[PDB]
């Protein structure tokens, strides 16, 4: 859909796929993310997390105090 | 569980009563990795719906039991340790056995004896304010 | 055995009473009416929240309610504008409001009136 | 209040863009004064104006509907 | 259907009323290869159990509808 990472839409067997509904940011990375069902969209590759602008290397998102 | 990954409870809240401060809860969803991979939504009525299919109570399975109670509510159970109550209009109670005595990360806090570290974020430091506390457990 | 014949007749258009005190009269629960054909496309508060699904039904000879009332979820037929609202899976209650992030919904009568 | 029963209020300058009630926000633009209590904007008069009702113990109020006459 | 194999119906019959000739039927099972491989059992009460799990009516699926009358 948009470079520089690949896209997937849905396998749609009984909807386990992580679509646009569950985008691992650097705040949600560890949390038990929910999955209502696969939705065709766009996402960065698994070894990556989104920040405010785009997806930047995992080892550079800040850790948040107050 | 946060140590052995044996359950997880996730709640959904939406605002009621056309007012700034009144915020309710609609539904609770429970996940049990022991039962393959089961999602058991609890809905606004007395409804239960496991893996998308509305079901008729009582339910018996490998180690899970769901059943009505006398005062028109529900009662989910798991083996000798976990237990829940839920009646329609957003009032959930969750009892828990002393087996999980110190291993829990959630919005209820870990389960040792001290209430002085109950605002402990997933990073590791505890917050002074309640507002920044709950913005850390969003999904 | 008697009712099987009467049902077979009705498929050919013939209507027949054949029921009297002293035979198997339906013993309808209280608050309901044994009355003959009542073309059921309503009498359930579900039909109020979903008004555009289907209505093509024949005569059935069931238990029904007086023509100002509807049946409740648990089985009573007292309500008029006291019967709940159905929504996406759940069940709400008269005079309720909620607002998540996209829509604002209340529910008057038996329908929603979601906006946004 | 007149003899007829007509109400009137006259506010001041230091409340520009700060009033919030049923006579609407106080601003120059006359198109965005149906904002509900939740902060969103609507078009329906009664949906906008039922969000500002107040209840007090004994007196409970329902949702108001436009007259069908 | 026997020619395209679209559905199949089976009934189970047992003896009732402690007599030689009083035989009844208990349950009905319908198999629809269209719904993957679905087994719907119709029980002695009004209960319905799809693939071993009871369901609460009404049910809607691809083209399948079950409801109380
Ligand atoms: C239900 O539908 C029938 C069919 O036209 C209609 O005559 C009746 O007024 C409706 N309402 C009730 C309460 O029966
Ligand atoms: C009114 O106040 C809000 C919030 O400070 C601001 O965004 C908006 O521009 C103000 N309107 C005017 C006309 O100044
Ligand atoms: Ca503690
Ligand atoms: Ca204005």
UniProtKB/Swiss-Prot annotation, chain E:
Disulfide bridge map: 16-24
Protein name as catalogued: von Willebrand antigen 2
Gene (name only): VWF
